[PDB]
């Protein structure tokens, strides 16, 4: 018998107002979820890369500095793994739900007025939550050098889960898994995504690797 503890946290309120608004945004152009997936993971690699210069040890947990994208049609899932700085348990609680940003209020406000477009989400510091434009439930694994590997889970409810992760070990970094929704499955099409990635890679300084999973 396997045993693990699952801690259950409750989302801040306007960052749950955000997930609500996002999952009902009948937006035609959702492809910025991937735009944000790449950027976030690029910013992560920058944090461990700039820490490299001032302390060479930080890379010892995982030498490779790259991004992997993993479309799985059978599992109905899109995975994006980076080998950046990664989050601790505290960093996941803080950065991923509980604490609100100040541009959560301002983003939703001008999304409704029309001043901001949904593709402008990343400029309000909440680019992450765009993952819910194409996914019903989002799961984040992370491994910072200062903590054990932890897994985050949310189906966009008022609620999220955190727990010590005993799945595929990451040396260091973040693995965000998108459990795609039926009407967005054409985003798992090999060519559709390939092209879409390289379209939103034209400014990325890191090696990207697209691993297409097959039946």
Domain ranges of the chain: 1-215
Q: Say how far apart CA 36 and CA 38 lie, in whole Å.
A: 5
* The 208-210 sheet, strands edge to edge: 6-10, 159-164, 150-154, 135-143, 173-180, 77-82, 67-72, 208-210
Technique that determined the structure: X-ray
Taking phi over 0 as left and psi of -120 to 50 as alpha, with beta for the rest, 136 belongs to alpha
User: Is 40 annotated among the ligand-binding residues?
Assistant: yes
User: What number of H helices and E strands is found in the chain?
Assistant: 5, 8
What element of type H or E holds 10?
Answer: strand 6-10
Helix axes 190-199, 32-54, angle to 10 degrees: 50
- Token digits of residue 123: 């400029």
Q: Say how far apart CA 207 and CA 67 lie, in whole Å.
A: 6
Report which DSSP code applies to 97: I
What element of type H or E holds 142?
Answer: strand 135-143
Taking phi over 0 as left and psi of -120 to 50 as alpha, with beta for the rest, 86 belongs to left
Quoted resolution (Å)? 2.7
User: Is 82 annotated among the ligand-binding residues?
Assistant: yes
Per-residue CA distances from 184 to 33, 67, 144, 212 (Å): 12, 22, 31, 17
Q: Say how far apart CA 146 and CA 87 lie, in whole Å.
A: 9
CATH top-level class of 1-215? alpha beta
Per-residue CA distances from 44 to 93, 107, 176, 200, 208 (Å): 17, 23, 13, 16, 14
Q: Say how far apart CA 1 and CA 121 lie, in whole Å.
A: 43
Question: CA Rg, the chain, in Å?
Answer: 17
Q: Say how far apart CA 79 and CA 154 lie, in whole Å.
A: 15
Beta-strand relationship, 67-72 and 208-210: parallel
Q: Please, is 60 exposed, middle or buried when counting C-beta atoms within 10 Å of its C-beta (0-12, 13-18, 19+)?
A: exposed
Per-residue CA distances from 137 to 30, 131, 209 (Å): 16, 9, 24
Phi and psi, residue 177, nearest 5°: -105, 120
The position carrying tokens 């997930």 is 19
């Amino acid at each position: 018998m396997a045993e693990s503890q699952v801690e259950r946290f409750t989302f801040q309120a306007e960052i749950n107002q955000l997930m609500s608004l996002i999952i009902n945004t009948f937006y035609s152009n959702k492809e910025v979820f991937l735009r944000e997936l790449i950027s976030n993971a690029s910013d992560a690699l920058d944090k461990i890369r700039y820490q490299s210069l001032t302390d060479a040890s930080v890379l010892e947990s995982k030498t490779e500095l790259e991004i992997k994208i993993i479309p799985d049609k059978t599992a109905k899932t899109l995975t994006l793994i980076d080998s950046g700085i990664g989050m601790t348990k505290t960093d996941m609680v803080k950065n991923l739900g509980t604490i609100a940003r100040s541009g959560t209020k301002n983003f939703m406000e001008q999304l409704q007025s029309g001043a901001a477009d949904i593709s402008m989400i990343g400029q309000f510091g909440v680019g992450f939550y765009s993952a819910y434009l194409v996914a019903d439930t989002v799961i984040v694994h992370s491994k910072n050098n200062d903590d054990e590997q932890y897994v985050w889970e949310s189906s966009a409810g008022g609620e999220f889960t955190i727990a010590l992760d005993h799945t595929e070990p990451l040396g260091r970094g973040t693995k965000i898994v998108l459990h795609m929704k039926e009407d967005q499955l054409d985003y798992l099409d090999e060519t559709k995504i390939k092209n879409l990635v390289k379209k939103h890679s034209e400014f990325i300084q890191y090696p990207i690797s697209l691993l297409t999973i097959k039946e």
